[PDB]
Amino acid sequence: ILQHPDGTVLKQLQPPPRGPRELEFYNMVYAADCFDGVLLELRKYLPKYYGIWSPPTAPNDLYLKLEDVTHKFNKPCIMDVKIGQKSYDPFASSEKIQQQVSKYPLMEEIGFLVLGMRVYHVHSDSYETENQHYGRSLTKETIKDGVSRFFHNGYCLRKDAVAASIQKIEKILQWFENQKQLNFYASSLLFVYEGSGGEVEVRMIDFAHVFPSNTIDEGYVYGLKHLISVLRSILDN
Ligand SMILES: c1cc(-c2onc3ccc(-c4nnn[nH]4)cc23)cc(C2CCN(C3CCC3)CC2)c1
């Protein structure tokens, strides 16, 4: 992710087939002739899409120009959560399935994985960052506290942001409960709140493994529901 002062991020297309798939996903969704009400509603929950972008002198070098979801924040607190029971897609090999499950074998059980968080602490005027290994360390025993960490400013638990996150996730869940045409693997929710009341972003990102489907995305739903349940329990801290 490259953060542009103009309020966008540039995301470089991943190597094929993933990068091209993500381009096609955005293209399909933000198709200017798209009257599909499912895809029209989905736009609300994605970064705004400004089309494919390449440097003036390098047509080879492909990026997506996306809304920076953090842009309107002063001190954004950012958490990326991979959603679903499976982070491998329907066309993965045995090896690829094994690669994906081994990365985090609790994916089926929990239905989400914290990819990272960046949390502004007021009293130190600084950020705590957690990486891949943080979320991949979390077990059933420690997931609730693992998530809670995101909402700690080093003086209070930001229950406002927790409650707001549930409310926004709920609308995304409603979207998924009303569509049977897309299944989403290894995709994420980007949570943002103000670290400097209820000012929150929750957006879907990372679409290198979104496939056509005939069924409810049950794995994504399970993850949203479980994530909500964790967030709900945190409101009782
Ligand atoms: C500032 C802005 C964004 C961001 O803001 N708007 C965004 C829109 C899309 C994406 C995006 N799409 N695909 N992957 N990221 C990312 C966006 C994302 C971040 C961080 C960038 C680093 N990622 C990594 C670290 C854990 C995974 C966590 C999220 C920081």
Side-chain angles (χ1 to χ4, degrees):
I1 279 306
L2 299 185
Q3 223 162 6
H4 201 302
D6 68 2
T8 66
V9 300
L10 295 181
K11 184 191 179 173
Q12 190 167 243
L13 259 74
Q14 286 160 289
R18 291 177 299 159
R21 283 200 303 237
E22 183 170 43
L23 170 63
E24 273 292 47
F25 171 78
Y26 275 106
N27 275 342
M28 151 189 83
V29 171
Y30 284 82
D33 56 351
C34 177
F35 56 70
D36 184 358
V38 171
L39 294 180
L40 286 189
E41 172 170 359
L42 176 58
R43 290 180 181 170
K44 286 189 275 281
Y45 305 119
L46 270 46
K48 291 182 188 193
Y49 177 53
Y50 296 97
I52 193 170
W53 181 96
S54 57
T57 48
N60 46 281
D61 192 5
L62 303 184
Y63 303 76
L64 304 178
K65 192 156 182 61
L66 301 172
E67 176 186 357
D68 184 343
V69 172
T70 76
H71 188 244
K72 74 205 150 63
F73 292 80
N74 174 234
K75 302 292 178 184
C77 303
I78 310 164
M79 170 174 71
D80 183 347
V81 185
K82 188 190 273 180
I83 305 302
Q85 284 179 294
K86 305 176 163 73
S87 56
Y88 57 87
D89 67 41
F91 294 89
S93 59
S94 310
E95 309 91 287
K96 182 51 168 176
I97 290 159
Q98 195 175 262
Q99 180 196 115
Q100 285 303 299
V101 173
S102 64
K103 286 285 185 178
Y104 185 67
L106 282 173
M107 195 58 172
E108 195 76 55
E109 178 158 350
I110 300 188
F112 62 84
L113 171 63
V114 184
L115 296 185
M117 55 177 75
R118 195 150 181 283
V119 191
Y120 182 66
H121 290 183
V122 176
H123 290 349
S124 56
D125 187 12
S126 59
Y127 285 78
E128 276 194 0
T129 60
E130 300 287 0
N131 68 22
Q132 297 291 104
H133 293 136
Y134 174 75
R136 285 173 57 217
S137 296
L138 296 180
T139 61
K140 201 66 163 285
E141 186 164 341
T142 54
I143 194 60
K144 177 180 164 281
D145 280 338
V147 172
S148 287
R149 180 182 288 288
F150 177 50
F151 296 105
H152 204 64
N153 47 51
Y155 84 78
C156 82
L157 179 67
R158 289 291 301 285
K159 287 193 178 167
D160 55 316
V162 171
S165 294
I166 292 165
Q167 290 180 305
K168 283 164 183 284
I169 296 170
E170 179 45 36
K171 293 299 189 188
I172 290 173
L173 180 282
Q174 282 168 352
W175 182 78
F176 271 89
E177 296 216 341
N178 287 288
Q179 74 91 2
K180 290 208 301 298
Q181 65 190 249
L182 294 167
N183 286 5
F184 292 72
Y185 304 95
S187 71
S188 277
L189 292 182
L190 194 65
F191 293 78
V192 195
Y193 75 88
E194 184 54 71
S196 73
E199 174 176 352
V200 167
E201 277 284 5
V202 177
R203 304 268 198 100
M204 290 161 70
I205 63 163
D206 197 358
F207 303 118
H209 310 263
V210 183
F211 292 81
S213 183
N214 294 357
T215 73
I216 291 291
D217 191 348
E218 323 95 346
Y220 196 106
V221 162
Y222 169 83
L224 292 183
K225 294 281 296 180
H226 188 217
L227 180 55
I228 282 169
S229 299
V230 168
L231 290 171
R232 169 56 184 101
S233 77
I234 293 164
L235 289 180
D236 294 341
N237 277 1

